[PDB]
Symmetry: D3
Subunit: 154 residues, 6 copies
């Protein structure tokens, strides 16, 4: 588990509408993770259905896609050690009802269909989702000035 | 199911220590709707009725005395599963067993000074709301972000 | 001398309630050292609102101002402290958020003068009038803060 | 003053390096302004020289361009009534020494060459800077759920 | 029991990353009383003496050199069960196992960069307090809200 | 030069009693200044009377000294460019009734006799106050990881 692991984090349209962009970004920023890509986007329905392709047969799929289209999305790539698993921990349980206070959903969300944000569930799915949402040149290369104080190793 | 209501009270120690704002913000930020609120020092008969289950406990008179020792911020919050999730936001009744990030896990130490109260069940909530609030004190309104907080109900 | 039991009437207008600013606004007054002695969430009738703004009944914005004050709940409060009337106004910021300084309530949270989130009594005498208009006397709670002697050097 | 006025706000590399992305966004989010475009970019030097074209003969021009190249930049377009003028007020004085606490520079910055952020200084400069930093399809059209609570008119 | 004391230290990474304020506020808001604090760069022998129980395990020389790499904010906090609740506030020793809401759950990632230290037992706290502070550096005072934090001493 | 300027900041007993230690430190931390010395201390009356020697003939002197004895004090030395003057601006006006919201006294204080904090009013007075409150070995020399992002030059 190296310090250059990457995950895809998105602020869903409800998170944008409810003014949660700053506080969500600060949650990852304060943790020590590094933002290498970010853009506000309103992606087409095809991209969103590809993003959720493994859920294309679940009954909430059509409503989830329609809701993911209903507003802007803040799409992000965060880099850091174990950023995929720890990122999921920071977001909280997929259903906010099972989320703990102190996580994103435990502080801000209630309904699973309005759970404010998305986080890649695996290293492999993160690479696929990063490629789906970003062009390679949208990922910025830089090194944080506090790298050696966040990490004891590479 | 999103119109479930619960009774939340800031106890006198929470008022004395300046926790009214932070506690309200916990429920506001989560997405619940405030439908009734008032700062009160209720009569002792109301407090004894509120804690009627514990009237024979050894700490009952001391609990009633402390609940009379300062103002109380009484609130009704509305939202899906607000009773159970409201209890989770407050944290364990004994702060020593509470997790940081909850109200008691951030601000409280002693179980007799746990700064807040929350109804433990939908049925108990309906009693406590009727005990603490007149019907005309519950305000009916629709949040501008209701459809962004809830997908249904 | 201006004593520590001066009182003012602070109200969170319907837009402040709708945008989730109840907690933040109360914290500004809590953190400053002022004491909350009365508070209730209320939906007052139009007559009460027109009385509250009686001195502006001839202003061109009065009709929409009253209607907007009826469009949602109001969090009505009485705060107690030394110079709480004037200092309360400073905390709220300029009536028009365009001319308010960041760090005040309006300088942090509002834009339009018709959506300036909050209200505060502009004088001691008008504070006493507004407190009686909005609250019954037995809704004002008498209590003493545990940190009174650390907020105040004198009565 | 119409509510659809736009301004360009940028978080300079020192603001990104010092973990101020979340706090700065929240300042504009909490005030009621609308984010219509955002991206983390490492722009080419020609774009930076054009952005600061008025200062191309100043003695600190080359040092300014070099520091603007030293890290990622969070570029944003915010929309709201008088967002250009009020945005400069939210940022505080260009020299943080003359800035008041409660503004961004009054809370986070000290040196004028490290003042963490940029804001358009006029309506027409905003249009020029928006066109320079953003493709027109990067501005997202949407309506805030609390628009009628922030604004009394159009 | 409300006079229990623990040793809390902000490690050089916490100082370097500008976390002194937030960490103090975490203990301050819980209701604990700060009775001693100083910014200090202790000698290597004191650091080796502090982690002497882990002297022959790995990561030892690296831990000492890192604890020497910057200033340390040493603190003594006082309150009921402050040793155990203090550790709960810090979060799990390895930040990857900590929960959001704790100090490490909000701010840290690597166990070798876990921002803070807290005594793990009442007896180890007394030793660390004696190791890090002279007796006259512990200040005696009573919080104005002591009776609103505690129901009993 | 001037980036190593130092001032004396103290959190008075009322600031300690009201649980404001964390917030006050965060104001200076966030601004970019470097904490080089700090201790919780209960100084004797002679040190307090020497600190306020230039006020021994003001009528509020005796009450000021006895109140400065009534609880612990958090004494600090902060380092940064113009930290003396900018420190005063961060604290706010001496009388909190004249302080602007967003400063420390504008956010937390009311009475001038309970104005929470103290800051050196001049470079020359800071040096005398620093030597009065701290031994030279209590000042810790270190280099902030983000020094080059806070300052453009020494
Ligand atoms: O019953 C369900 C399950 C999921 N979702 C939504 O579908 C997304 C993707 O579901 P997944 O199982 O991938 O959970 P996640 O990986 O997002 O935690 C979730 O974030 C929810 O917003 C939903 O609306 N209803
Ligand atoms: O040993 C105890 C148990 C409870 N309480 C107080 O009594 C209240 C009611 O306790 P209950 O069992 O109903 O738990 P809750 O419903 O408050 O979570 C608690 O919140 C405490 O404030 C107390 O002082 N001592
Ligand atoms: O041109 C104006 C002036 C005022 N108002 C509103 O009506 C109130 C009138 O209050 P006043 O002019 O007495 O100033 P305030 O005491 O609120 O600062 C203001 O707070 C605003 O909410 C408005 O909508 N338009
Ligand atoms: O003496 C100076 C003046 C300006 N700048 C930098 O150049 C930018 C552009 O200056 P301008 O006059 O446009 O002020 P702004 O419009 O950014 O407030 C400033 O923000 C600073 O970052 C600088 O480094 N030194
Ligand atoms: O594998 C490890 C275990 C611990 N530590 C460090 O050594 C300290 C002491 O470890 P201990 O087992 O005492 O845990 P603690 O009591 O600090 O929670 C920890 O806080 C870490 O900073 C480390 O660098 N690597
Ligand atoms: O009428 C006064 C003036 C000052 N003070 C206190 O004594 C200090 C005197 O400091 P000075 O007048 O030099 O101003 P400062 O340097 O603190 O801004 C103030 O900070 C207050 O805490 C007071 O109690 N009454
Ligand atoms: Mg999935
Ligand atoms: Mg008026």
């Amino acid at each position: 588990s190296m310090s250059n692991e990457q995950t895809f984090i998105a602020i869903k349209p409800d998170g944008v509408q409810r003014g949660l962009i700053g506080p969500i970004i600060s949650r990852f920023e304060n943790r020590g993770f590094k933002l290498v890509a970010m853009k506000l986007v309103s992606p087409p329905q095809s991209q969103l259905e590809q993003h959720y392709a493994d859920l294309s047969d679940k009954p909430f799929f059509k409503g989830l896609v329609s809701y993911m289209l209903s507003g802007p999305i803040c799409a992000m790539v965060w880099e850091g050690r174990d950023v995929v698993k720890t990122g999921r921990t920071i977001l909280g349980a997929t259903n906010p009802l099972a989320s703990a206070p102190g996580t994103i959903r435990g502080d801000f969300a209630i309904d699973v269909g309005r759970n404010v944000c998305h986080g890649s569930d695996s290293v492999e799915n993160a690479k696929k989702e990063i490629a789906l949402w970003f062009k390679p040149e949208e990922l910025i290369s830089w090194k944080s000035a506090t790298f050696d104080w966040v990490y004891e190793k590479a």
